[PDB]
Amino acid sequence: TATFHRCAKDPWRLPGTYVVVLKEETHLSQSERTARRLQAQAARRGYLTKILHVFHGLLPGFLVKMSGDLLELALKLPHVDYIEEDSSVFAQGGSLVEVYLLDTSIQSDHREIEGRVMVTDFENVPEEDSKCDSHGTHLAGVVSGRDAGVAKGASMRSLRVLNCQGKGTVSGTLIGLEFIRKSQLVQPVGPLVVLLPLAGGYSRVLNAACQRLARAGVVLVTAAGNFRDDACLYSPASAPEVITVGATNAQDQPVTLGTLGTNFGRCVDLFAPGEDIIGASSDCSTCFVSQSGTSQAAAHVAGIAAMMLSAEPELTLAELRQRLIHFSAKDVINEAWFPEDQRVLTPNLVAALPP
Amino acid sequence: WNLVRIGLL
Amino acid sequence: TVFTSWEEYLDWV
Ligand SMILES: [Ca+2]
């Protein structure tokens, strides 16, 4: 039977908005019929409701703004798999390959990335509680930047899912992922790499969407998270078929970020450089700045993967994973920085291009 | 340091 | 520290 889920990080919860996920083979007409049913049954009980979005492509279901009072009712609807309360996520060669970036707005005319980044018209961000585009612009530059990029031949498409403070929603991220899959079906191109340099609490729906996208043949790279914690407790970091990237520094140390730092554990696939990373600064068209985080590390791995996929376009996801591991530097990271029980579980791998 | 680390130079 | 050109970053590092 159908279950209800909400973010375990209580300050990250977004009460009043729910993702109703329907069973796997449900098609659009049914999803719409189920949404209209909910509204009608709700209205019968005096409750106002608004359908914000109907999903199809990866997940069948819909986004509804309504009172949580209606959850028991909604969970008895036909075709419902589960319902998840929305919650927040936060900012943390290559020529045949398209790299999608879901992040903040970007400065596309920055000389480092000018002409290699295409701003899609997709935008889904929550209202706030040069600066708006610092995070995305730096990460675009890490992937494909002319002077400081990993994969200079890669072309990028950017979607905006984080606001000016680097905050987005799970629901907004889902709609962004759906938009990527939709665009692909409409106009197929080569291998896709989807970069998700963000993280929220463990999300069943976000992990499921990522898993479906991966099963459909798309490569997903994510930030492990900057909480000095087990990456399995965060999403999309914990989605298994995603490539989850932790951050190391020039001394082969896991990265310290204030009192926190890189996440670790069995959900991390490998590490990459993620401290003191020079890259495009959106302050001016030729400006550069150094930044740190698992976002930057993920961006390195998206660039390596783009180069690898351009060289070997037939690689399956599992084969791409084997290459990333095979080509990594091994056992260079200081394991003593990790909690004692996590040292064996945390792969001692720093990503590298093949020579 | 990062581009050298990943073997780009 | 924001550098206004790539070369300014190169001289710095
Ligand atoms: Ca994985």
Side-chain angles (χ1 to χ4, degrees):
Chain A
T1 42
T3 47
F4 171 64
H5 310 262
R6 81 192 192 176
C7 191
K9 303 279 161 155
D10 204 76
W12 296 354
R13 287 171 53 206
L14 295 165
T17 304
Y18 300 93
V19 189
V20 184
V21 184
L22 305 183
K23 290 167 166 183
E24 188 159 314
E25 276 186 32
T26 308
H27 62 255
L28 183 53
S29 281
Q30 290 172 308
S31 299
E32 294 172 344
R33 250 182 283 117
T34 297
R36 293 334 180 270
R37 182 86 48 80
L38 174 50
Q39 297 207 285
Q41 290 194 280
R44 217 164 279 157
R45 290 149 178 79
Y47 287 83
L48 186 63
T49 63
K50 191 177 203 300
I51 307 306
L52 299 175
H53 183 86
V54 187
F55 300 95
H56 58 110
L58 294 171
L59 287 176
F62 55 89
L63 190 66
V64 59
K65 182 182 171 183
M66 63 177 191
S67 180
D69 297 357
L70 298 156
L71 285 165
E72 278 172 333
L73 174 64
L75 284 168
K76 301 168 184 171
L77 289 172
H79 320 283
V80 174
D81 196 3
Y82 55 101
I83 302 181
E84 185 174 319
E85 181 189 69
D86 203 3
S87 63
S88 309
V89 299
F90 305 89
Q92 300 299 301
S95 46
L96 298 183
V97 173
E98 203 108 294
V99 181
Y100 276 86
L101 178 68
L102 293 77
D103 204 276
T104 60
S105 61
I106 74 122
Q107 191 199 320
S108 57
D109 63 358
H110 194 284
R111 300 289 266 194
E112 191 69 349
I113 63 177
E114 164 176 34
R116 300 173 183 185
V117 180
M118 188 266 171
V119 176
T120 72
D121 58 6
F122 186 81
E123 179 180 292
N124 196 303
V125 299
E127 61 190 323
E128 281 75 0
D129 295 294
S130 181
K131 248 286 198 63
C132 299
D133 52 19
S134 303
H135 191 251
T137 300
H138 192 268
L139 298 172
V142 172
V143 176
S144 57
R146 289 182 170 83
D147 289 309
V150 170
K152 296 170 189 188
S155 76
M156 304 185 66
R157 301 189 165 271
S158 72
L159 289 68
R160 192 200 192 202
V161 302
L162 305 176
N163 69 13
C164 295
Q165 305 158 340
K167 184 177 200 185
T169 60
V170 155
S171 68
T173 303
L174 293 179
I175 298 165
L177 290 171
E178 169 184 86
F179 177 96
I180 292 181
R181 176 59 177 173
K182 277 188 188 171
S183 302
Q184 191 195 10
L185 292 161
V186 165
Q187 273 273 115
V189 287
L192 299 184
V193 179
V194 178
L195 176 55
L196 288 148
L198 54 86
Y202 183 99
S203 169
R204 181 183 179 175
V205 75
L206 189 51
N207 284 9
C210 285
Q211 171 169 60
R212 288 165 202 238
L213 199 42
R215 276 171 188 181
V218 179
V219 173
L220 277 75
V221 181
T222 195
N226 297 340
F227 303 105
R228 203 174 182 164
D229 198 8
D230 189 323
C232 303
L233 314 175
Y234 303 89
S235 291
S238 64
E241 288 191 65
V242 171
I243 296 164
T244 296
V245 185
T248 53
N249 72 17
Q251 290 72 230
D252 295 331
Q253 214 63 221
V255 175
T256 302
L257 302 166
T259 60
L260 306 175
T262 183
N263 284 351
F264 44 74
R266 66 180 181 80
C267 290
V268 177
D269 289 292
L270 76 180
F271 294 75
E275 177 171 315
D276 187 21
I277 304 308
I278 192 73
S281 170
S282 70
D283 277 11
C284 83
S285 58
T286 58
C287 284
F288 289 81
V289 73
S290 181
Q291 296 191 11
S292 293
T294 54
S295 282
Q296 281 72 30
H300 277 82
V301 165
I304 297 164
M307 295 252 260
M308 282 178 169
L309 284 165
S310 272
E312 302 181 85
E314 287 178 11
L315 293 171
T316 66
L317 184 63
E319 290 169 339
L320 171 65
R321 206 181 164 278
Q322 288 171 332
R323 258 74 165 175
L324 286 162
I325 291 171
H326 173 265
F327 287 113
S328 295
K330 314 221 168 48
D331 295 324
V332 304
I333 307 167
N334 172 35
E335 297 188 7
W337 188 97
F338 300 128
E340 298 176 357
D341 301 327
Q342 297 290 356
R343 295 171 190 166
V344 62
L345 300 172
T346 298
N348 198 327
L349 299 175
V350 184
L353 292 165
Chain B
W1 74 273
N2 51 306
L3 306 170
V4 176
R5 212 234 190 275
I6 73 170
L8 181 63
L9 264 172
Chain C
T1 313
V2 177
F3 311 101
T4 59
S5 80
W6 180 245
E7 296 74 32
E8 197 197 352
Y9 154 79
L10 289 184
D11 292 344
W12 179 277
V13 74

